[PDB]
Amino acid sequence: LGTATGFDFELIDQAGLGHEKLTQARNQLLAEAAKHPDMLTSVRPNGL
Amino acid sequence: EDTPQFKIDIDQEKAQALGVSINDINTTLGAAWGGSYVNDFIDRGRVK
Amino acid sequence: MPNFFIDRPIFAWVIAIIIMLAGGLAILKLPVAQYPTIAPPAVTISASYPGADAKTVQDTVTQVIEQNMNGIDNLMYMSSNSDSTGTVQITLTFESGTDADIAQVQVQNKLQLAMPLLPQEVQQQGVSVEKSSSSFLMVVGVINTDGTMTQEDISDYVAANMKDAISRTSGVGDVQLFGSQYAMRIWMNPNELNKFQLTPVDVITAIKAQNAQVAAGQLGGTPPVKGQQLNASIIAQTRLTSTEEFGKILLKVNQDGSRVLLRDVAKIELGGENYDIIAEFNGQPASGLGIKLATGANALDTAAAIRAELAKMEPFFPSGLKIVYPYDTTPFVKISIHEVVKTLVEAIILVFLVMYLFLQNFRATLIPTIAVPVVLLGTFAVLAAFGFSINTLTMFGMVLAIGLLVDDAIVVVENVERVMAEEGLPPKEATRKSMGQIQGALVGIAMVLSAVFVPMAFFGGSTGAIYRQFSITIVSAMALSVLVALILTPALCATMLKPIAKGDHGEGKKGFFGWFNRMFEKSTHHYTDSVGGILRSTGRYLVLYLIIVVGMAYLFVRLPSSFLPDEDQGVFMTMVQLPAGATQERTQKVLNEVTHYYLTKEKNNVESVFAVNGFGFAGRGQNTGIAFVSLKDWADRPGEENKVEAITMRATRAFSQIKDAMVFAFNLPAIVELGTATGFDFELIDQAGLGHEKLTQARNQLLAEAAKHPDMLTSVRPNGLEDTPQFKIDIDQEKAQALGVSINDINTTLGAAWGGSYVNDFIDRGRVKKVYVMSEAKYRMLPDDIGDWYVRAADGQMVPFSAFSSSRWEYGSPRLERYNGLPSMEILGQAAPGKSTGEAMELMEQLASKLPTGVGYDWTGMSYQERLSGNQAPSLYAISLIVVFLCLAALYESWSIPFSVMLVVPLGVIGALLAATFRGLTNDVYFQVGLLTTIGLSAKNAILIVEFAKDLMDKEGKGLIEATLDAVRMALRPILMTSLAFILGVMPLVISTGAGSGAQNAVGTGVMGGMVTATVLAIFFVPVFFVVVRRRFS
Amino acid sequence: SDLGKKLLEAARAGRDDEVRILMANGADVNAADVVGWTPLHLAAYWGHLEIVEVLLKNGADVNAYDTLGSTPLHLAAHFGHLEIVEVLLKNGADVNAKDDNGITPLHLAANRGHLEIVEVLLKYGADVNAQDKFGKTAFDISINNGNEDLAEILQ
Ligand SMILES: CCCCCCCCCCCCO[C@@H]1O[C@H](CO)[C@@H](O[C@H]2O[C@H](CO)[C@@H](O)[C@H](O)[C@H]2O)[C@H](O)[C@H]1O
Ligand SMILES: CCCCCCCCCCCCO[C@@H]1O[C@H](CO)[C@@H](O[C@H]2O[C@H](CO)[C@@H](O)[C@H](O)[C@H]2O)[C@H](O)[C@H]1O
């Protein structure tokens, strides 16, 4: 159940786009989440 | 029901006399008429 | 509840019928086997490396598997041994109550993942994971009398024809072939191979090419050219099927054009996979099938079905082939069941006689005749419900129950007959009152007897499993007897019995019964006068009690102890160990003498001798062998002179004369599954990588120190083999590379010729079988033959093995043991006469502490079980003793009075110990259960006397002595009736000389002797106990 | 013989008291198992110094050879039994004894790198230039094993 009021999210490659396209899609979501400090906090990847 | 079968006999004595290895005969015959699974490849980011 | 069913007799019959049908149903569905699952779940990993030494097997297979045996649940310990036959066996023993299927699949799964780490030769042969803890139902022997078939010829037939059919038979759970099916044996010749400049490398390469299944394809296969009409599969080269085809295998074509075939450079025949074991049945070639019983199957139905299937095969056997049964365990199960029915039939017959002797009316003799069978059938229903089976232990459990089932029947009926004779009430009113006196007591007795036997089932390991069979059977039988005593027999008594006039004691009759009634009435007044005099001087009888209690303790300590009694099983073994380096032929000559002795000097005892050359339990090799002696029926061997123990002693002494061989006979354990279970099992562990040689020196040291204590330790020897001379050959790498000879071709030519090589498979009459290449005997015997083998160099020149090799003699292990991953050496031994096994372990631990640094130890098998069992015993006795008190304390409404009942325990134990000590028996399970039952009924007798005595004081306001004298008078008849019937009931068990007598003797002796004292003493001591206790406390 | 097989076991196990009793009863000291190993061969192998001396006192063959030509000195030198090597050599052990391979006690000693034993063998006149069936000397073994200490001794 982990942290109290936190979430574990998974961004999936459905069309077989590629790692490069998925990293860009991740960055777009990370950047759009940074525009919402009022709701979302410490949104980051668990990978390298 | 019982099916007709095409029995093919490789004369290994004749093969040796002509200088042909039985491995190359078995592979040629095997790969040609039956097919042969060589290795895998990546098709749009999936092993096939 | 008794009142409820006295007014509702048909309801009481319905419950009795419901119980009967449940029992009758249970009897049909109940599993039937000699013994239940005693030994803890054990999974054995078996692998094979053809032509490999113990160290090659250990360092490439055993160690690799051991390291991967992780993530497996409920493992107690792991043990393995690697021997010079090229065999390894890793046994993983699990916690008792572990699912054997889950245990095996978890072991199997970890092996599968470790398979790619093993040698290619071991992966070819494969690695078997089997439940080894299971035992054999019977061993079917297959022989050839007209000498037309070898053991290989017989083995192949059984495998190809008989095995699958027996495996399919109803109730069969496992079938192991005692031998192997045919293999295509290529017996290579080095002189012929060198003549044509060929090697075993060429022979192997050629077989792999010309004996193979080649994939081709299809005509008109998909995707096709549209318009195609026919689609046919293409068949190419398939496997060879005959010795002829293998003979025509081409190896070389010469310059002149002449062809070199496999038959030119080798002998080609169908033979065995290995020739290590030679099996003979009365000197004739033999194979066989080891058949195990399936889970829940009926042993008697299974064996009958196996014989039925073999009977249908009989018309299709080749001439000379015969079926023989050297080992069969069903005769025990059939006799164990028959003697149970016989006992309980005689028990009902005996009650009838004693009931009519005292009560003298057939109406009263039929109440026990109905009640006893009802409770027995009831037990079978509870037995089935708890997942128990009909076995020796559960069957003798019911024989030991009858004394307590019969008692309930007599006590109820007798008490009603007395009340009618004394007060003159009608049967219905008499039963209501009679039950009112005993109903609270019987419920109290039920709770006490539970507290005696139930805790005994909560022992752990092997001993706990054995005790649980007796515990549940007796507690179930006891429990149902009380329900039938509070439901049926009250209803029967109220309806079936005939009224007795007030003061009618049968003294008005004539003949025998008129005389008997006068005698007994006079004897009762004589007895009550004796108690009156005993109670005037309680002081001296308290002294006499302490002498019995001290006398009890004395005998209990001096009585030799042993888990189970040695039984004449109609089978025993003769171990044959020859010196280090001794050959197969030399061991056969000794086995022939053993076979000759048993068929000559024991012609009237021995049926057959199964001579197995090459196999031993303590290790394998050409220098070991065992002869399995199969005896005639017990009825065709009268007296102790014609018994296993007598013959064992005669054989041991007879074979003492034989030179260069350690030959001796010995009986099998009571439970083959469990093992020896007499002595200790010690493991000596290398904890700091000391090595084999250093672990040998530390072992010799421990053995030497054990020999200096004959007073404590006896027969303390190693279980494994000793180091033997082995032919070390050093291949010069420089010389090999110089002459242009590869190491692969050198190590293949050596390994293939001398060791043998499993090349590939071929199909013999629609059966896939192995192809082995190996040197013909005469070219792989002596070190001179090493030089006769040639290997081709790159330049095509044939170089002899002597050119690039050097040899010497060294010593090495032909059997390397490992315990829990670390190198070990198993040491067996036992406590000296008079000494306990526990004391012997204490010293072995002390001696082990003074061994060199890095040398550890551990307790395995029976030793591991004994220690964890010994820890439980104190806590269980305490629980058992506390609850007995608490139950009696509630029954009598007193903290003090319970002691009067609990003081009778030694009165029954002294008689049992006197009987056992006199007859020369041991403190075994059957005896120990015999004590608990003797204590049970002796307590039951006392409980009723104390209850009656107390109730008379409480209700009618009688004095202590008045009530006690009145109580013993009323209690005399039913005590004598119960004792008389039960002592006569266990008479056949004591005097039994034939089959399963060791069990019956242990059962009967302790019970009969105990009952005699428990009867004679209690009637005089119970009144003393109650009086002495009552006087002290208030 | 009976006692011959008991002495073979006694000599191997290293039971000095049993060997003593066997020498008194007259156990065959020239007794040999299937491979041709005498009690002295075994005593030398398993490193039982006291029994080697007792056996030699009772006329045991010091230059006894097995079915492959190896002597007790070969075994004593190979397995690094300095005390036993000296006793054997004092009692007239062939220092240059060749097995069927042409291997000597010096070769075997040099191979396992027993520096003390090598110098004892050379003291009693070991042929340092002795060649086995491959033409290898104790020196050729020393440089191949990479034993700098042993290399210096053989110069
Ligand atoms: C009909 C009514 C009677 C019901 C009977 C109920 C049966 C009792 C259930 C428990 C059975 C197991 O019994 C249990 O054994 C373990 C040992 O394994 C004991 O544990 C023991 O540990 C160590 C072992 O050296 C002892 O020093 C210690 O005195 C003891 O506590 C428990 O104290 C005991 O409760
Ligand atoms: C050890 C062998 C097995 C025997 C087990 C012991 C119990 C059975 C023995 C027989 C019991 C009967 O023996 C009984 O002894 C007592 C001794 O106080 C006698 O009592 C005797 O002393 C009392 C006073 O103390 C007198 O009042 C009485 O007149 C006198 O006979 C009883 O009259 C006799 O009947």
C-alpha count within 13 angstroms, C-beta hemisphere, residue C94: 22
Contact (CB, 8 A) for C624 and C576 = yes
Q: Which two tokens stand for residue C413?
A: 């009926």
Measured CA to CA, the distance from residue C710 to residue C287 in angstroms comes to: 44
The alpha carbons of chain A give a radius of gyration, in whole angstroms, of 12
Residue C185's contacts (CB-CB under 8 Å, 6 or more residues apart) are C268, C269, C270, C271, C772, C774
Residues in chain D: 155
* Nearest Cα residue in chain C from D135: C735
CA distance C180 to C183: 9
End-to-end CA distance of chain B: 35
Cα C107 to Cα C81, C93, C122, C552, C679: the distances in Å are 17, 11, 18, 50, 30
Ligand 2 and C1020: CB distance under 6 A: yes
Residue C810 β-bridge partners: C726
Beta bridge partners, C142, equal C287, C323
DSSP string for residues in C50-104: TT--HHHHIIIIIHHHHHT--S-TTEEEEEEEEETTSEEEEEEEE-TT--HHHHH
Q: How many Cβ atoms are within 10 Å of D69's Cβ, its own excluded?
A: 16
The Cα–Cα gap between C305 and C169 comes to: 7
Cβ-based neighbour number of residue C97 at 10 Å: 11
Backbone angles phi, psi at C647, to 5 degrees: -65, -40
**Using CA atoms in the order C627, C628, C629, C634, what is the torsion angle rounded to 10 degrees?**
170
What is the rounded distance in angstroms from the CA atom of residue D28 to the CA atom of residue D64? 14
CA distance B8 to chain C (A): 5
Residue among C215, C185, C229 at smallest CA distance from C203: C185
Supply the range of the domain harboring residue C262. 184-271
Query: From the CB of C737, is ligand 2 less than 6 Å away?
Result: no
Answer yes or no: are the C-beta atoms of C275 and C585 closer than 8 Å: no
Å from C210 to nearest chain B CA?
8
Give the residue from C85, C141, C135 showing the smallest Cα distance to C279.
C141
For residue C287, give the nearest of C134, C149, C384 by alpha carbon: C149
- Count the residues in chain B: 48
Resolution in angstroms, to 1 decimal, for this deposition? 2.8
**Is the Cβ atom of C539 under 6 angstroms away from ligand 2?**
no
Q: Does residue C796's CB lie within 6 angstroms of at least one atom of ligand 2? A: no
Ligand 2 contact via C668 beta carbon (within 6 Å): no
**Cβ C879 under 6 angstroms from ligand 1:** yes
> CA–CA separation, C1032 vs C458, rounded Å?
37
Contact call for A13 and B45, based on CB within 8 A: yes
Question: Residue D24: which residues within 8 A CB-CB, separation 6 or more?
Answer: none
Q: Is residue C112 in contact with ligand 1, taking CB distance under 6 Å?
A: no
Helix (H, G, I), strand (E, B) or coil at C27: helix
For residue C234, give the chain B residue with the closest CA. B6
For residue C32, the cross-strand partners are C298, C390
Cβ contact C216–B8 (<8 Å) = yes
Comparing CA positions, the residue from C822, C828, C549, C879 lying closest to residue C675 is C828
**Closest-CA distance of chain D to residue C811, Å:** 9
Please tell me the number of Cα atoms within 13 Å of C117 on its side-chain side.
Answer: 15
User: Concatenated DSSP letters for C645-678?
Assistant: HHHHHHHHHHGGG-SS-EEEEEEPPSSTTT---S
**Chain D interface includes C871 (CB < 8 A):** no
- B8–C234: do the CB atoms touch at under 8 Å? yes
Whether C660 sits inside 8 A of D5 (CB atoms) is yes
Q: What is the DSSP letter of B48?
A: -
Cα C250 to Cα C596: distance, rounded to the nearest angstrom:
49
Task: Search chain C and give the residue with CA nearest B22.
Answer: C209
Measured distance CA(C501)–CA(C495) in Å, rounded: 17
C328: β partners: C138
Residue C401: closest CA among C444, C452, C357: C452
- Lookup: tokens for C973: 């008849």
Could you give the CA distance from residue C866 to residue C463 in angstroms, rounded to a whole number?
Answer: 8
Cα nearest neighbour of C232 on chain B: B5
* C214 shares contact with chain B (CB less than 8 Å): yes
What region, left, alpha or beta, does residue C636 occupy, with left being phi > 0 and alpha being psi -120 to 50 degrees?
A: alpha
Of C445, C463, C875, the one to substitute when testing ligand 1's pocket (max ligand atoms within 8 A of C-beta) is C875
Chain centroid to Cα A44, Å, comes to 6
Both tokens assigned to D141: 């073994």
Instruction: Find the CB nearest B30 among C214, C219, C233.
Output: C214
What angle is formed at CA C965 by the lines to CA C964 and CA C966, rounded to 5 degrees?
90
Question: For residue C98, how far is its CA from the centre of ligand 1 (angstroms)?
Answer: 20
| Termini Cα distance of chain D | 48
CA distance C1002 to C553: 20
Burial class, C410, CB count within 10 angstroms (exposed 0-12 / middle 13-18 / buried 19+): buried
- In chain D, which residue ranges form alpha helices assigned H by DSSP? 2-13, 16-25, 39-46, 49-57, 72-78, 82-90, 105-112, 115-123, 138-145, 148-153
- The runs of H, that is alpha helices, within C454-487 are 461-486
Enter the DSSP assignment of C635: G
Measured between alpha carbons, how far is residue C441 from residues C340, C537, C895, C935, C936 in Å?
30, 29, 17, 17, 14
Name C1016's Cβ contacts closer than 8 Å, sequence gap at least 6.
none
Kindly give the distance from the C-alpha atom of residue C533 to the centroid of ligand 2, in angstroms, as a whole number.
6
**Neighbour-count burial for D30-39, b at 16+ CB within 10 Å, e otherwise:** ebbbebbbbb
Report the amino acid identity of residue C475: V
- Strands B6-7 and C232-235 come out as parallel
Kindly report each contact of residues C779-785 with a partner whose C-beta sits within 8 Å and lies 24 or more positions away, as own/partner: C779/C188, C779/C189, C779/C190, C779/C753, C780/C753, C780/C754, C783/C727, C783/C807, C783/D67, C783/D68
Residue C999 CA to residue C985 CA, distance in Å, equals: 16
Distance from the CA of C911 to the center of ligand 2, in angstroms?
21
Q: CB of D47 within 8 A of CB of D77? A: no
The C-alpha atoms of residue C845 and residue C847 are separated, in whole angstroms, by 6
Regarding the beta carbon of C526 and ligand 2, being less than 6 Å apart is answered: no
Give the single-character DSSP code of C316.
G
* CB of C820 closer than 8 Å to CB of C745: no
Contact C216 B7 (CB under 8 A): no
Burial class (CB in 10 A: 0-12, 13-18, 19+), C89: middle
Q: Which two tokens stand for residue C629?
A: 């002696």
Residue matched to tokens 């399995």:
C628
- For chain B, the C-alpha Rg in angstroms (whole number) is 17
Nearest CA in chain B to C235: B7
Q: Does C852 touch chain D (CB under 8 A)?
A: no
Residue C258 to residue C272: CA distance in whole angstroms: 33
Q: Is C446 left (phi over 0), alpha (psi -120 to 50) or beta?
A: alpha
CA distance, residue D68 to nearest chain C CA (Å): 6
∠ CA A21-A22-A26, nearest 5°, is: 120
User: Which chain B residues are within 8 Å of C230, Cβ to Cβ?
Assistant: 4
Distance C31 CA to ligand 1 centre (A): 31
Are the C-beta atoms of C54 and C620 separated by less than 8 Å?
no
**Distance in Å, alpha carbon of B42 to nearest chain C alpha carbon:** 23
Can you list the alpha helix ranges (DSSP code H) found in C424-460? Answer: 427-453
H or E stretch covering C259: strand C259-261
Binding-face residues of A in 1-48 toward B, CB within 8 A:
13, 16-18
CB atoms within 10 A of CB C511: 7
Contact C581 D13 (CB under 8 A): no
Q: Of the bound ligands, which one is closest to the alpha carbon of residue C534?
A: 2
Amino acid at site D131:
Q
CA–CA separation, C112 and C608 (whole Å): 43
DSSP lists the bridge partners of residue C80 as C90, C818
Quick count: other Cβ atoms within 10 Å of Cβ C849? 8
Instruction: Answer positive or negative: Cα dihedral of C536, C542, C548, C552.
Output: positive
Q: C968 with C531: CB under 8 angstroms?
A: yes
Distance CA C91, CA C608 (A): 32
Helix (H, G, I), strand (E, B) or coil at C714: strand
DSSP calls for C274-298: --S-EEEETTEEEEEEEEEEPTT-B
Region of C877 on the Ramachandran plot (φ > 0 left; ψ -120 to 50 alpha; else beta): alpha
* DSSP assignment string, D88-133: HHHTT--TT---TT---HHHHHHHHT-HHHHHHHHHTT--TT---T
Helix axes C960-985, C330-358, angle to 10 degrees: 140
Give the Cα separation of C437 and C490 in Å (integer): 13
Nearest in space to C216 (alpha carbons), one of B34, B12, B4: B34
Burial-class residue C957 by CB neighbours within 10 Å (0-12, 13-18, 19+): exposed
Q: Give the domain CATH number at C191.
A: 3.30.2090.10
C455 lines ligand 1 (CB under 6 A): yes
Cβ atoms C968, C528 nearer than 8 A? yes
Where helices occur in C565-612 by DSSP H, the ranges are: 584-600
- From the CA atom positions of chain D, what is the Rg in Å? 16
Q: At C184, phi and psi to the nearest 5?
A: -75, 95
Residue C173: closest CA among C272, C100, C78: C100
Q: Residue D101: which of C659, C734, C807 has the nearest Cβ? A: C807
Residue reference for tokens 């003390």: D116
CA distance B42 to D23: 82
DSSP states along B3-46? PP-EE----HHHHHHHT--HHHHHHHHHHHHH-------BSSSS
Give the ligand with the smallest distance to the CA of C882.
1
Cα C976 to Cα B9: distance, rounded to the nearest angstrom: 94
Radius of gyration of chain C (CA): 36
Note the Cα C752 to chain centre separation in Å.
42
CB of C556 within 6 A of ligand 2: the answer is no
- Residue C874 makes CB contacts below 8 A (sequence gap 6+) with none
- Packed helices C427-453 and C925-954: angle between N→C axes, nearest 10 degrees: 140
Report the alpha-carbon distance of residue C467 to residue C61 in Å, rounded.
40
Question: How, if at all, do strands C768-775 and C757-763 pair?
Answer: antiparallel
Atom 34, ligand 1: residue with shortest CA distance? C875
Surface-to-core class of residue C460, CB atoms within 10 Å of its CB (0-12 exposed, 13-18 middle, 19+ buried): middle
The set of chains that have 3 or more CB pairs under 8 A with A is B
Query: Please, what is the Cα angle at C262 between C256 and C267, to 5 degrees?
Result: 130
